[PDB]
Amino acid sequence: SVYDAAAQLTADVKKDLRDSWKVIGSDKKGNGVALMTTLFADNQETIGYFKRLGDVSQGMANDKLRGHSITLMYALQAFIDQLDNPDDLVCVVEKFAVNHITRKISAAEFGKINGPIKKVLASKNFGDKYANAWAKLVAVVQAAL
Amino acid sequence: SVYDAAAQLTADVKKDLRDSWKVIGSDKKGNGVALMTTLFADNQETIGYFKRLGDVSQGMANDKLRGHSITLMYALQAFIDQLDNPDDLVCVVEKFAVNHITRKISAAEFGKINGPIKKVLASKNFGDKYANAWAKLVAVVQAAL
Ligand code: HEM
Numbered sequence A, B: 001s002v003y004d005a006a007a008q009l010t011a012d013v014k015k016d017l018r019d020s021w022k023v024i025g026s027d028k029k030g031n032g033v034a035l036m037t038t039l040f041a042d043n044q045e046t047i048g049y050f051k052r053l054g055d056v057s058q059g060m061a062n063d064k065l066r067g068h069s070i071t072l073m074y075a076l077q078a079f080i081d082q083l084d085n086p087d088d089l090v091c092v093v094e095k096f097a098v099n100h101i102t103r104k105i106s107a108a109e110f111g112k113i114n115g116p117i118k119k120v121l122a123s124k125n126f127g128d129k130y131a132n133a134w135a136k137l138v139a140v141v142q143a144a145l
């Protein structure tokens, strides 16, 4: 359950999330778009869920993609900000899951974001330790889908 | 249209928005919930749009309401962060409008949030000067609906 997955965020895992986010969340537009383009490149099958965004290969020049990418980073920001209180992290995660459930996005489908995150982290000199920490966070959202 | 509404966001308006957000945004859970509960108390009819949240009379103690309230504050954070680049503000505001248009929330209906904002600001001692600035930000969103 989401309450059990949230308890998997141990002390060091939370610390690593904060340390990496400090750098990554420093450029929400840049890292946000990079995150989305990497997803579409490594998992072309997910582009179908984003028909409304139009020509996704345009990248930064696509206003709708840019708007979505920026917005996505604020959701991550919200998660990081709730790490201190498990009860608040959970209600924020379930709130966020509502619309993804409506789009019929499964836990397995959501998990495809781990690849893009690992690559963006690596581009910033953050290794496997950090990618695994983020996977743990993503797993909390997966438990709610 | 949205671009034109953004044009009303002058240097002084943006300054007052950033100064007031520095305080209001420091307690997203507290002020977020205060905003929602004030909206429900002053305009009971708006509760119709929030059936999913359940017993909203519970306030902060209602996990779903608390979850939605915290999340709402990150949308405002996004707007505030894009104030210096109209191009980014616009794409973020339009991205934000998508779900509200789908819910059939008109510009007039959305405008009902102005009262709650004015009251929350006043509780922190931010007068009409600041309330007018925020009304202008809400007007940019209204232009997108
Ligand atoms: C780090 C992971 C992710 C984050 C933080 C994230 C964040 C968001 C946010 C904040 C929104 C806007 C609010 C809403 O409508 O729910 C959204 C929309 C959306 N998300 Fe997610 N999401 C993530 C991953 C995914 C994945 C992996 C998929 C699909 C395989 C997905 C599909 C969608 C779709 C289709 C939309 C609507 C886009 C539009 O039409 O503008 N999301 N997501």
Ligand code: HEM
Binding pocket: A095, A098, A099, B046, B049, B050, B052, B053, B068, B071, B072, B073, B075, B076, B096, B099, B100, B103, B105, B109, B110, B111, B112, B113, B138
């Ligand atoms: C400045 C004011 C407002 C902000 C910043 C805001 C922010 C948000 C955010 C971030 C979400 C989550 C993403 C989404 O589903 O779109 C949302 C959801 C929603 N908003 Fe807005 N909103 C505002 C005012 C309103 C108003 C006035 C209404 C209606 C009278 C409204 C009705 C809704 C509803 C029904 C949801 C879904 C709630 C749920 O079932 O969890 N919003 N809003």
